[model samples]
Target: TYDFKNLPADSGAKPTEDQMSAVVATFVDEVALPTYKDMLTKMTAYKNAVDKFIASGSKNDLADACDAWRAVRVPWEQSEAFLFGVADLAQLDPSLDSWPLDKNGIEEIIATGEFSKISGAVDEDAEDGPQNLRGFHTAEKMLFLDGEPRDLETSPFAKNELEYLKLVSERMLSDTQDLYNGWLKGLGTSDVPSSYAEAMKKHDGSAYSIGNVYQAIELMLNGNNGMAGISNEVGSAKITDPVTAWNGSNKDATDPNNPGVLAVESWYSWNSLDDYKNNIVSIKNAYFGGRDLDEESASESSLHALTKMINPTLDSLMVVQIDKTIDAINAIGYPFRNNLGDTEHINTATEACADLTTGLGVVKSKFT
Candidate 1:
């Protein structure tokens, strides 16, 4: 769709139209056929080499497997591609290039190696076990990819590089503050529903009017029904802003309002009971009460419209995410949801999408 309100301007090293096409192709090709191919290939090769080495009874092979498995495959394939792919899409400038790993990182793992000095000592009361390794590895990633943990404070980047990445993320946070706050303050508790509890409740209460049940629920929640965003936090604190920090605010604190959260909240607020009932009436007028133009299906009651209009905003995000990013890659026709956006992070892209889509489902199921 041509956007008349927004005009493009000549700006910084933006890719040319043709270059962008090529970049997209590269992303698709890379994401699809070979997103994690190199790492898998290397690991498979290592596994084969180790098997051969073990058969030959060489101690070196065992050592090689341990080293290669941990050092090479695990780092790149199991983690980095997903991590950095998400970083690229999320518009975060991965810190690895800047901080880089150091010897302290590697040596910190030696406590498990039967060497005390190498790993050094805690007060005998300090953390240990996989925690020792976890801490070390986390430090390395923080130092390398995330910029010394503290640099995450000064690091610059926006979400998915979209023009509205910063704005949307900020608004999304603010709009959903109550959801997070609810979790923090403990609303449902053991008394709350679990695993489609709300749906089940309605399903039992209004099996004949399932659609009405869904509508009533969605109208109450706004856009879709889901939990507070804060409940999914890595560790709960206060719901803070993703905006100010997103913008180059030299501090590590979150803002009170993230636009993405706000957008979501607004969407839900727009679905309030009275508002949604009116919307249903509008829907009936647009389709059920209209001239035959609304429904062409053999099922006389069904409303028909272009599929793109089903959930326009969501469909827009789905297309824009892939179109904008994959255009830079070398391939096409790959799955965007599974292939990119850093599912491993469980916070930014993955959790964010899940929260959005699941909420969409909640709304759809309730209204239908």
Candidate 2:
């Protein structure tokens, strides 16, 4: 039997304005702000660890930096489900995690000793912009090799890469803080209001700039980087891209010069699986109106609450789908870069993500 077919027939939830307001506001208070704060907090620690590592150049400090890196990414990945607001307005998403990182370019930069190349502001438009050169992945490549921290003494880049790494780390921290301020403090520029939290709480047609709470709800659910969008991204795009490259004529896994390993962003740290899993957790956070990854009740305000208000079947199904996606991703095996050719696990994860995306779609349909 098909998995989604077994669900109850559709009587969708019709939401009152108050209900939409509750979900949207709670998303900011419970989900978005908390996630952003964690991102900023961990990033601060990451930057400090980077400084310590750079200053000491000791093997143990390198280990500490790498350990801090692993901690920083959890909140950032979990924030992906709701990148529609200030994140989109300021182009902070790509600034933080843009891919297609040109390692050769990194080599050229390192060889040239141009630390300023990436230390400046993120020029988000150009394909070979600093975004690809800096941010999480770039730092990961310099700090981690084959999923473990690099030993400074023997590493090839021990002498030359530290400055570049330190610069990128600073930029990374500043941008993360900018993201936090955009939510909590506001950029105070065009489309970037001074305080997004005020806009969410007061519904003043500022920040997100929507006159109606339903539009706000739609933005949260089906926007370009919203819950459903991220589901397709994680389940389909991120997983499929690397696998497609592996399966295609460009199967030259040995060729780092080409777009082979670069197809996956978290490969340097072997973090692709965890990245995908936490994205689903972001969806869970949005659904449950809480930060915990465990199960929750509809008593709390959330997208799940809104869905159940119209169709409890859809709500229940979404929970099943979220857990299914997480499990499927975990089954993809560790160090996801090496598992790209393991077609069976990849297909299972992809199918699970598709089912999850479909469930999210059904919820969107019911609401909007």
Candidate 3:
């Protein structure tokens, strides 16, 4: 746990403009571009798996598809720590990752028998539409049912659901590729074309400023509350109860019978713990640039090295805090679905997030 009483003051001098720019450049090169490329690769593999499952009506194919989904989900969740570029500005997160899936709305779509009409536009707009109907969550619905891989023999809507699965997987692949192009090929939307990698190079008079490096770091540590990280309702302090009428009582978080449709991401396959742990892996990658903790030195080209240029003591402190955060997360048992309702695990996870937030807060102040 972080000690608030004896915490170091933000007395560290800021780095020079050139140093900050270099740090930003390293982040774009080492973290951002690589993350998108990996996402593209994983999604492509997932798409192929879906094709195989669609080709063969066998249960083995379904298991392979589920494994592929887990593969794609890990990298995407890890990439969320630096989700400001193509993923955020282009409005891809909600389209791909919106959770607590509108199960009733999805059932309505299935009832209507118009899976072909479920395009991205319809998904984005319909109040009770495809936005909730498409993406990983939608795929999860088809792939995982009632906390286990859906068996084709038991699923009545197997054919329709298979069609929905193929369509959603294709869309996810296309959008993820677009995000990759925005970084590597500069082929983003009309509003913001011209590579995000190039955008990061601009330190003044541009939308992509050097300060985003710090913002990325801050976001990695704190997470996007309701979107990515531990939810407020589930974390340390309860802001809104997830177990209310609005959340559909037991339907919100603790639905052991239907874990996939529950309030968490990757709950069906029991990959929630992996998602949370890999997020810390991303934070570590962004901060240390692939270097081991003990290996971080002034000679290394990393956020840690750059920070050391300003304050060695603060850099050292930040390192320890980062380790503690990762350790706390690892301490939690696997298949987070089982632990969601456990008071001990929830409290432990909440405290870990709080510890990380405090360290990041101090780091942000120091950078400022």
Candidates 1 and 3 compared by lDDT, better number = 3
Q: Choose the strongest candidate by TM-score.
A: 2
Task: Give the clashing pairs for model 3.
Answer: 123-131, 186-195
Expressed as tens digits, the lDDT of each residue in 1-368 for candidate 3 is 32633555544566665766676677777777888788899999999999998888778988888988988887787676576667766777777877657777677667776775556553555666556778888898789875688867687454667787899899999889888887776664574577777766654435544355554344433445311243222234221122122234454344454432344566666666677666666666767765223333322666677666666666776677666666665666555544444445545666666665555555555444
Separately for all candidates shown, the number of backbone clashes (residues 3 or more apart, or on different chains) is 47, 2, 2
lDDT of 2 by residue, 176-227 (tens): 8888898897887876867877677667575467667767777677736898
**2 against 3, candidate with superior TM-score:** 2
Assess every candidate by TM-score.
Answer: 0.22, 0.92, 0.82
Query: What C-alpha lDDT values do all the predictions have?
Result: 0.27, 0.79, 0.64
Candidate 3: lDDT of 215? 48
Count of clashing pairs, candidate 3: 2
Error of 3 at 229 (Å): 7.8
| Model 2: ten consecutive residues of lowest lDDT | 292-301
TM-score winner, 1 or 2 = 2
lDDT of 1: 0.27
Q: Which ranges of candidate 2 are over 4 A from the true structure?
A: 1-13, 158-160, 249-260, 297-299
